[PDB]
Every structure is written in structure tokens, then in C-alpha cells.
Design a protein around this nucleic acid. Structure first.
Ligand SMILES: [Cl-]
Ligand SMILES: [Mn+2]
Ligand SMILES: [Mn+2]
Ligand SMILES: [Mn+2]
Ligand SMILES: [Mn+2]
Ligand SMILES: [Mn+2]
Ligand SMILES: [Mn+2]
Ligand SMILES: [Mn+2]
Ligand code: NA
Length: 326
DNA sequence: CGGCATACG
DNA sequence: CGTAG
DNA sequence: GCCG
């Protein structure tokens, strides 16, 4: 009934099991903070199964047969159904370790490994980190200075304004180049914590060298608060009533031959792409990334002119972006 | 039991 | 090590 | 943690 891989089923942005999925996602996040990537994946997959269901789970019997539900995830759901809270989830939520790792890992430039080392050193707050700044990378300094703005949701209005400025710089950098909105906004989200753009040109090879030219032009317009090639992880100055706010923007370039693969990868979701790559390799023997799809037996790359082509190569029914919210 | 996606900066 | 989806 |  329910397929085992998230790329085999539609997953809408909004659904009928929000509270249950959010609880399993807390456990997934906590597993990641402890380095348990296998448990993280199971909890993420179980949460995603619930997002794909056509109606609310009301009774434990409704889980039997569902993929990725074993003793642990089933008990979590049982406790939520019976009591409205899961004791393990609540213990994680209030724990100093979870709260501090969440705080630190949400800083741009800080991953689980850095956050854990800081935790073991006794650091607990953002001001703790600001008090010893020479121990920070340039990226972390920017992440900390802009942390408050970067925690503020990005709206669709913001996205449309950013796209116009990126298009202007891209047009001077290379006439004919195009800018496509990707990431969660392409999946239908009305808000987000960042904006993602994919840039190409219709003539294969003309996009070579493009991203430095785009970055320099945005920098000379005073729009770049931070930047560090094919991928640029920036902080942009976005106008606001009588002021402005910092916004994370990712700019990516791909040649038109690779564009459908890059569009698919950068549209996500993260779990969708991991599941699609797992399905490709384990079920079809093909190796997928955001550059291409490789047959390792014939030693050839599949040509694709669209996302539709990629789903067909993999033997999967097509899912539009708004059904990829695994 | 092994596997768990696969890139770039 | 960080970043991306 | 779960699956094959
Ligand atoms: Cl890639
Ligand atoms: Mn358990
Ligand atoms: Mn009980
Ligand atoms: Mn994004
Ligand atoms: Mn490349
Ligand atoms: Mn992004
Ligand atoms: Mn094992
Ligand atoms: Mn285990
Ligand atoms: Na981070």
C-alpha cells in the first residue's frame, strides 16, 4: 500500500499527521546531534510516511504494515495518541544538550561537530561564543553577527525582490543567462529561512566562469554582506521599510546539460533527494547526483532535458515539486 | 549482518 | 571542517 | 532504527 522509498509516493507540504511527524522529527534531530545517522534516517523516514498518508492516524493498528514503523516509532505514536505527549520527546525537548546543540548548529558556519566540541567545552549561549571571537572562522563570525536576521522567516515578497536583483547582475555578467528559483520555495513553501537560485545559459559552456562575474557585480551594488566556483553561500542585504535585513541566498551555476539534475537536487527536499539517490543505486543500479545519472555497467551518462526525463529513466512516476516535501 | 546520498567551498 | 538539497 |  505505502511504498518504502519517499520518492515513490507524493508528499504534500501540508498534511493530516502534523503533530505525529513533528515528534518523530525531534527524535531524528536529537539522533543527529549524537552522531547516530542511522537512527536519524529511520525517524526522518517514519515521519515522512505519516506526511504521505491520506488522513489522520487515530489508532495504533493503522501503523501495522507501514514501512519504517517498528517498536520505537510505534511507541512514540502510541503515547501521543493515548496521552497527547511522548515522554521521550518531552525529555529531549527540555534537555540542555538538545537545546544548546540546536542553538549552535543553527548558526551559519557551525555544524554538529563544532557544536558538540563547544558544548563539551562548557559553552552554552551565543554570547559565550561572542566572548572569544578569535576562535571563530570568518564564516562563523558572519553567522553570529547576522544570527538574529537569519532566524527571521523569509517571505515570498522577499524572494521576488531578491530574484530581480540577481537577474540584473546575471544579465550583465552574461546576457541570455537565466535564473530559476529552487529549494523550498519551488516546493510551495510560503516562507523559508533562505533563498536558492539556479543559473544556467542555453548555450552549453557559456556558463563557465559565470559565478565570479555575478558575485562581483552584486558586491559592487552593495548587496553582499558576506560571501566566501559553482556554488556561492551568501548573506545578502535585503531592503525593508526604512531599513534592511540580512538574508541567506545560495547561488548555483550548472551547464544546460546538467540543469535538470541540478534543478532536481536543489529543489529537494533533503530526504527526498537522499531517498531518490538510494532508490537509483539500490533498485536500479544507477548512480545519481546533482550533475547527472550514471550507468556504471555501460559507463555512460543519461541525457536529460527535463526532470520528467529523470523520473522516467528511474522508472518512477513523476512528482511535481510540491509533492516532494518528504 | 551492512547499509544508510552524494556532491562543492 | 563547513555548505547544499 | 529499521529493512532486506
Ligand atoms: Cl552533485
Ligand atoms: Mn528503542
Ligand atoms: Mn500509556
Ligand atoms: Mn533553501
Ligand atoms: Mn560541477
Ligand atoms: Mn539555501
Ligand atoms: Mn549492524
Ligand atoms: Mn542501531
Ligand atoms: Na549550521
Amino acid at each position: 500500500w505505502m511504498p518504502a522509498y519517499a520518492c515513490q509516493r507524493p508528499t504534500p507540504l501540508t498534511h493530516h499527521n502534523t503533530g505525529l511527524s513533528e515528534a518523530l522529527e525531534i527524535l531524528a534531530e536529537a539522533a543527529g546531534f549524537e552522531g547516530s545517522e542511522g537512527r536519524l534516517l529511520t525517524f526522518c523516514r517514519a515521519a515522512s510516511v505519516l506526511k504521505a498518508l491520506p488522513s489522520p492516524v487515530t489508532t495504533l493498528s493503522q501503523l501495522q504494515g507501514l514501512p519504517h514503523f517498528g517498536e520505537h516509532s510505534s511507541r512514540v505514536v502510541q503515547e501521543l495518541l493515548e496521552h497527547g505527549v511522548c515522554e521521550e520527546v518531552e525529555r529531549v525537548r527540555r534537555s540542555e544538550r538538545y537545546q544548546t546543540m540546536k542553538l549552535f548548529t543553527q548558526i551559519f558556519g557551525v555544524g554538529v561537530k563544532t557544536a558538540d566540541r563547544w558544548y563539551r567545552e562548557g559553552l552554552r549561549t551565543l554570547d559565550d561564543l561572542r566572548e572569544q571571537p578569535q576562535k571563530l572562522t570568518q564564516q562563523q563570525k558572519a553567522g553570529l553577527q547576522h544570527h538574529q536576521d537569519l532566524s527571521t522567516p523569509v517571505l515570498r515578497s522577499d524572494v521576488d525582490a531578491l530574484q530581480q536583483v540577481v537577474e540584473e547582475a546575471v544579465g550583465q555578467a552574461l546576457p541570455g543567462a537565466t535564473v530559476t528559483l529552487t529549494g523550498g520555495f519551488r516546493r510551495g513553501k510560503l516562507q523559508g529561512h533562505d533563498v536558492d537560485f539556479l543559473i544556467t545559459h542555453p548555450k552549453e559552456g557559456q556558463e563557465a566562469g559565470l559565478l565570479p562575474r555575478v558575485m562581483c557585480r552584486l558586491q559592487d551594488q552593495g548587496l553582499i554582506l558576506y560571501h566566501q566556483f559553482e556554488r556561492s553561500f551568501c548573506i545578502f542585504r535585503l531592503p525593508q521599510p526604512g531599513s534592511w535585513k540580512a538574508v541567506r541566498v545560495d547561488l548555483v551555476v550548472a551547464p544546460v546539460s546538467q540543469f535538470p539534475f541540478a534543478l532536481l537536487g536543489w529543489t529537494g527536499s533533503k530526504l527526498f533527494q537522499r531517498e531518490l539517490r538510494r532508490f537509483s543505486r539500490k533498485e536500479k543500479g544507477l548512480w545519481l547526483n546533482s550533475h547527472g545519472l550514471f550507468d556504471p555497467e555501460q559507463k555512460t551518462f543519461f541525457q536529460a532535458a527535463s526532470e520528467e526525463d529523470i523520473f522516467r529513466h528511474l522508472g518512477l512516476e513523476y512528482l511535481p515539486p510540491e509533492q516532494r516535501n518528504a
